[PDB]
Amino acid sequence: GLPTTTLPGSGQFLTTDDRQSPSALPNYEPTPRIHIPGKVHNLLEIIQVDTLIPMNNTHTKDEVNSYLIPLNANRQNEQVFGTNLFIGDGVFKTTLLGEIVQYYTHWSGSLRFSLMYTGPALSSAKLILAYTPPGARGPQDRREAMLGTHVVWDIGLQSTIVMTIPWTSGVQFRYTDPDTYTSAGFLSCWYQTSLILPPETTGQVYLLSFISACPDFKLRLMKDTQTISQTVALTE
Amino acid sequence: GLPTTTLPGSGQFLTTDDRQSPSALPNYEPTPRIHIPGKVHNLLEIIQVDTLIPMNNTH
Amino acid sequence: GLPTTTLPGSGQFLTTDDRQSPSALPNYEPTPRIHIPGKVHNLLEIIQVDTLIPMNNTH
Amino acid sequence: INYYKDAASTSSAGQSLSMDPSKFTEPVKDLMLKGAPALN
Amino acid sequence: INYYKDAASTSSAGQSLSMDPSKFTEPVKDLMLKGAPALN
Amino acid sequence: INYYKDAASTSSAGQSLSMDPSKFTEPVKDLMLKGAPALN
Amino acid sequence: GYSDRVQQITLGNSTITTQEAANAVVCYAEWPEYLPDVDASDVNKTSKPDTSVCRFYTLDSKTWTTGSKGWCWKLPDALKDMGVFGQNMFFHSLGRSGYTVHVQCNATKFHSGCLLVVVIPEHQLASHEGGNVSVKYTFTHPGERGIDLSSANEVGGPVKDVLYNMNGTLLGNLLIFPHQFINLRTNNTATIVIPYINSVPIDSMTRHNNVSLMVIPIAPLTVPTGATPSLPITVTIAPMCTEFSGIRSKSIVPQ
Amino acid sequence: TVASISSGPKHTQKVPILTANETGATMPVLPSDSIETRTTYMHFNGSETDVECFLGRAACVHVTEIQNKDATGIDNHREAKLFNDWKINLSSLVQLRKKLELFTYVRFDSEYTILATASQPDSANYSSNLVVQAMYVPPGAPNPKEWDDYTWQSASNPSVFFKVGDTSRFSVPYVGLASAYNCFYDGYSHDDAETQYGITVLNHMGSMAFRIVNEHDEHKTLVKIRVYHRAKHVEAWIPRAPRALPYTSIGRTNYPKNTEPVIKKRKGDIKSY
Amino acid sequence: TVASISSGPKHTQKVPILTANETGATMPVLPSDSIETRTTYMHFNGSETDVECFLGRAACVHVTEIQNKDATGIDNHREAKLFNDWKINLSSLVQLRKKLELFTYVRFDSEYTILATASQPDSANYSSNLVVQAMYVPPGAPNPKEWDDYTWQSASNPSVFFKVGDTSRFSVPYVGLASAYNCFYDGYSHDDAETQYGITVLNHMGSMAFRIVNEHDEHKTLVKIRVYHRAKHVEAWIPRAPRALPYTSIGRTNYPKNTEPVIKKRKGDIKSY
Amino acid sequence: TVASISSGPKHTQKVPILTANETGATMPVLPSDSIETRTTYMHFNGSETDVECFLGR
């Protein structure tokens, strides 16, 4: 008989501990694995695939239309859309990125925001996208917007433009749930010159917008998502 | 005295676990084995012998 | 199963003991350290800096 | 590691990995080859 | 040290440290180079 | 022997045995030698 | 002078040419291949009709109009009646296949509109009734007709609400599945190569569909002034590396 | 590892930021393709986002309850909670369910922890000490009928005996019939016109039975069982869109009617911040 | 090591005891610079004044309380202490606080010990055996609302279950967002005219929730939770003046008005002994 | 280990499927003696049918 002493914590059950256990089914042989395409190893692998952002959130019931950012022909100087960058809330929240970020407490890294244009091929347009780093207000006019991170996008044969929100930060991690100290800025978009439709054409054209994370990205300290809950256990 | 911590499951009895136990009969000597024809090792050995099927179940 | 005996003191919590514990946050990666001037290692380092004595205590 | 002195006190045995059904499936005196006629 | 005989009884696995998003981010048949035109 | 995988789970650290009060007791720009005049 | 843009796919006795492609997607970066022995379970030698089943079948055409919500086809169902592919299907106990899907929609440089073409492995549909109402067989086996997401709820059928992918997930995130867009201004076809994806090496072709192909208008169709307000969309699909096993009497399936 | 390299002004014919999303790719664009950057290192590995880590902590998967009371004159033990069943499944409590359904096929060993606590809602002199016996009844094995049937002998079926207030823990290998468990299944068990659709047809693994071994004392004792499940040795294939609407049933994808808009409406314009 | 060397009479032009304190230095003068000394050795290392040792013992950081009682008809569990919260922080109980605030920035792993004892202030037949479940609810994660919400499933959030009367112990890595925790912060969360000033804005880490897993017995049971915290792997920068006045608030430096003189007045003259 | 070997058409004078059960033997006939098979491996050892396992709980 070897002398032992038990410490504080004996008998506790910590849902996060990782130890060995007896197998209830001694000697059982599991089914062989066969090959299946698509294996995922890290959630970091999947948040780099871009998905659509319901940017046009202004509706009243969920609709395919809140994915469409409208553009008006012949407007000059004006603003196309605006949003803050609380990736865990608001427009971002239902996107795959938003949806995964919510399983973690802290995030750090660059984001990739792209816009794909869908107007007739014989039209043309020049837009400016601007990222405003924390510390200033959402820009109120392009002059204000153009003094921060921006890209003049020229609509052409190449249909999409990929803007990166480079990680601009004092503190090396921000909270995924919206926090002030930890806030990330604003994203706005304005006409640089203006949309022009060809003859025989009319109305609004739309941009689709996507979001995905750069390879830069870090997420840490897992927790429970506000995105799902329940009141009684389900049954069959 | 070596410091320990006990985990969840301590004291449980799992009918399928396989561990050592003290022998109640210390030092006892079992009867020698003699040879007996017919030893079975796997149930897989015996399910290969065919047996009759009551196919005509209608009684 | 290895035979053990527990000694007096089992289960006690001594605020001054120093042992290992399971991490509640398995696999979490702490923020990198950056350099900060001023690191203290011993209280003996700081009690050698002189400070003023309110000698005139009479107020 | 056995902690105990007697053999009865050790855990379960380990797989025969013996397996030879012929004492049960083919106890015939003259060997039968599959493919050759059963009765010659 | 495993104290148990079966593999299911061992603790959690250890980090894939595999990581290759291209099956998801670039499943295109003809390879796209960043910087070269998307559609030629 | 660490029984656990993560570093936070290990016991207390071990004595710095670093000890250098000069950042606190003598942060002067030009070095002062004891015995030499303070102000020259 | 090769462009990402022009392409030719020849499979069996049938060929497709596109002069306005946008590359092609190969699901999960894997190309269809036959079933290796190391992965095999059924001991039966399989049948590989090759060129008689691995050719291009063009399903009947759809009509995109400004009110369209989107369409959904299931595989191998959509092909249950195409030539010898279909016969093989009803006649063997098990079968396995990959596909090349080519979705076609051309317009002019004055039109606008953008379709999402996506392949969803194991697309289990939801009942519009809620609770634990099931979706009857016939409803998930529309055949070449596919399911029309702008048709009405029916009884025992699935829900046809587009912002929810017919299963409780948002349209916006379908982009995690192999997919390609058809943006009239860029593109005129979409091509996806689908490797066989299952948790078993070979399965039944009638009780289980292993992918749904979905074509969904996202930026509404907008035709030039006084143009007819609609465009046809055509889907052509070719089984590839098909294998059938466990031949017999010929399945009889509901309805 | 560098998180960002140093990059300076650019005036090229080589534009990495113009792409064609119609292709289905997400081109790997970085901050340094469009602004001037400085070197920085990652300092991070992505350890805690490994799927083994993501699915590897215990989650509550089931809460049931049984009572110890005099069975004298009870015509239906099962019905008196003299014991009870758990038609095993992981899809019943939603926190873990949404996590698993981020994948289509999943393969793992399970580690179960079972916590049992007792309640004595009405006047008792004391708290008795009860031993629970959880038994694994697989498909095709005789379901128990009374709280003390021959079934409980469990001569061939695993069973663990632990005390109320304590916890029991053991681990079961991956018992799936195929190579992975289907998180989703767009099929039927056969081509029947009315057979059920979905996964319930597939994920058939039997059930669990709990009972108190103790005979009855003078008062009644409520014992409530909580089953926790931890995946170990995880393997996951084919990522899918996360669950947006609420769940209604074990094993079907169905969402409730007149559900509410899941995308938050702006308080303001598209232009609003 | 010598504590003092031998030194004899001196008649020099080299005076180590005259200095200019205006310079900001504390010149390293020793007994042997001004009296005649003999050799002596230190016999000591300064082991127990290492900061790891100073901050490394468990200190009580929080006492809360929850009760097990029939929740039937309770409209606000939180309010009935059917469970309770601890808006985690280390600055609430003062013994440890004064110790930490001897430094400006501090970095360490935490080891928590949680002791739970039960009280039955009014007539009970017995003492029941309750299991506590302490859950970590981080910022942005759904706060519980009832004592038996879906939240308690805690499928992704650590949680420990232990028995009242026992102790639970686990250790959490340094969870700070920056490189160190700020013991002080002379800033705001943004340039707002009315935002709060200080550290409360910074040291935001979420909270802890405790509850009893047991349903109710016939009597009521008070369970009082004590959280102890031990720093391990300590790193401290920039020493500061010790706290002289009493504390009034978590996270602000504020002292109470009409406080009392903190320097003891002489009973006598400056000249007094 | 192979569970089934590959085997093709047969037109022989050597018939493994005709036997005389009166002899008391169970002749070891396999799928590949009477249909055309493909190779497949066992992937299994028969561990949990060992008598030690069967009587050991």
Ligand SMILES: Cc1cc(CCCCCCCOc2ccc(C3=N[C@H](C)CO3)cc2)on1
């Ligand atoms: C005593 C005792 C009790 C037991 C029980 C052993 C466990 C058997 C059950 C195995 C796990 O069964 C599953 C149920 C569901 C799923 C699953 N649901 C999701 C959609 C995905 O996978 C996987 C396994 O063993 N010994």
Ligand SMILES: Cc1cc(CCCCCCCOc2ccc(C3=N[C@H](C)CO3)cc2)on1
């Ligand atoms: C179950 C369970 C419960 C828990 C809780 C984990 C601990 C998380 C909290 C981390 C410590 O948070 C801090 C609070 C304050 C300070 C601090 N206050 C002083 C001024 C200095 O530092 C540092 C860390 O984990 N698992």
